Amino acid sequence: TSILNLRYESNHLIDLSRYASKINIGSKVNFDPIDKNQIQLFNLESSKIEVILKNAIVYNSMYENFSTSFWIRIPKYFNSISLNNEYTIINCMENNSGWKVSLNYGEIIWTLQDTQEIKQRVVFKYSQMINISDYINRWIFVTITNNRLNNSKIYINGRLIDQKPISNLGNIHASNNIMFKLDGCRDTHRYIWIKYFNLFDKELNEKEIKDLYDNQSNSGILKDFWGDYLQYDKPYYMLNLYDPNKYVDVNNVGIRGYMYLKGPRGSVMTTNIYLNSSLYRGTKFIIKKYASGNKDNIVRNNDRVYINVVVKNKEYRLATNASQAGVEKILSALEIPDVGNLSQVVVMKSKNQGITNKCKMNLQDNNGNDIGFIGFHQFNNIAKLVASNAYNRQIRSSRTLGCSWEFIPVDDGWGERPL
Structure with missing residues (x-):
């Protein structure tokens, strides 16, 4: 069902999808030695991963539905330099159209924009003023679905967090590539962990999202x-x-x-x-x-x-x-x-x-x-x-x-x- 399946196969990060989009790994990308599927991206210039999408699957439509899923571990925000500073982390915008995933103090933002400057945002917010957080510095499963006829939805660990209308958006022509890199982040020591990134050519339903969540959990291995x-x-x-x-x-x-x-x-x-x-x-x-x-x-x-x-x-x-x-x-x-x-x-x-x-x-x-x-x-x-x-x-x-x-x-x- 995925048109893009980023996984660490042999000793390289590749696309397990039928399209096999090319992948360029910057020299400052770190891979978890015990689980090379976990990727660490620092707020450093060459700490990036670019995916060159086969021309066949580049998004360019007024009605095609699509979704995206991935797990992320966001370090706790430590000081004031991180306040009010939205930085991009997964970019598929080209000429101001397409989609992108961004972060900011206590939030995960989804952004969609058509070729006429019409855009919409969907956000997930978590507090750092809490005894025990299910989200802070812990692996979270993020899922974003887009139904061109009505709404865009963001899920966290399989549950619907928020949704916003996108029906008013005209043609969306995303980028030919996808850039995984901290963009516009002012915190010099910032980084994120991310793994199991996927792209789907449909609007995933609650059930599919859940099965995705349970299966990518590797329930046979204990977790800290x-x-x-x-x-x-x-x-x-x-x-x-x-x-x-x-x-x-x-x-x-x-x-x-x-x-x-x-x-x-x-x-x-x-x-x-x-x-x-x-x-x-x-x-x-x-x-x-x-x-x-x-x-x-x-x-x-x-x-x-x-x-x-x-x-x-x-x-x-x-x-x-x-x-x-x-x-x-x-x-x-x-x-x-x-x-x-x-x-x-x-x-x-x-x-x-x-x-x-x-x-x-x-x-x-x-x-x-x-x-x-x-x-x-x-x-x-x-x-x-x-x-x-x-x-x-x-x-x-x-x-x-x-x-x-x-x-x-x-x-x-x-x-x-x-x-």
């Missing part, structure tokens, strides 16, 4: 907070979606100690620019390889692993004694050499047979049996972390649960200073 693939041997600050205001801490190390959700999660801010909940708090978790010959360091849907915990700069092993009384098994931080026969094998999870689910850690005993998903339980006003089979069952519901976690690694797009 930013939406990147979850990795092994990579320290992560933990976030429990059920109770975001707290962070993981360790009472004491050892079998007679425990892990719990401590006091108030802080806030990070830059006056007049952003105010969000602190994300680099608590004892870090490191996913360790168990009985695996994993070449890459990517964590997949049913991988069996070990969870190391960092306490006062020393790594310990997450474990528990399942013989413990009660359904909820309280977890502890064990000296690695002394884990003995304690349960410690964790099955990572990204989906149920089933759909997405945030509960991603199912502890198993040494007999290959479920102890339960890792979450937390209230023990006399103390929220200790536990592995509970109760979670498994209630999962009959895809809502946020006590076992819904988020792994957050340090990222430059967030800008918070750790420790």
Whole structure:
């Protein structure tokens, strides 16, 4: 259905569509080594990608419908230089006609203009004054559809955000090429991550957009907070979606100690620019390889692993004694050499047979049996972390649960200073 399918095939970025439009990569374009489909464009002159569209698919019409989709990770806007400064990022305008995607402080703009100076804009806006943002510095799926008879629509993660009429626009003659480059951006350290760009010769419907969203999600691979693939041997600050205001801490190390959700999660801010909940708090978790010959360091849907915990700069092993009384098994931080026969094998999870689910850690005993998903339980006003089979069952519901976690690694797009 796509007339343009930009994907990193072999060792080059090409167009997997039947048209095979030529692609020129500037010398300052960065590709994520662990997932070369993710492209990083800096606010630097030669950090650009130009797509030369086959003359056959260049838009030039009064009634042809078309859409476009792609994922993007926009770093948090850090200071006043980014206020009121709309910069283009994907340009298909030629002689002031065609389309283009732009950004500005807290927004993603779509622009359509015909050859008679008649134009329309569709915008998505998100705030940087929020505890936990689904959008800031995280991979978002953007979809823009255009029905020449009535409206243009912008979707974010499969849901309709806004729509505007375009029926009054006459002939639109877009550009022969598409320029992916930060244009007119005043912030010298600005950049964006983008991947899976597509172009369609029709107005995608809600269902098609959803299937596009679910399929390009790679549901078989776990993701960290930013939406990147979850990795092994990579320290992560933990976030429990059920109770975001707290962070993981360790009472004491050892079998007679425990892990719990401590006091108030802080806030990070830059006056007049952003105010969000602190994300680099608590004892870090490191996913360790168990009985695996994993070449890459990517964590997949049913991988069996070990969870190391960092306490006062020393790594310990997450474990528990399942013989413990009660359904909820309280977890502890064990000296690695002394884990003995304690349960410690964790099955990572990204989906149920089933759909997405945030509960991603199912502890198993040494007999290959479920102890339960890792979450937390209230023990006399103390929220200790536990592995509970109760979670498994209630999962009959895809809502946020006590076992819904988020792994957050340090990222430059967030800008918070750790420790």
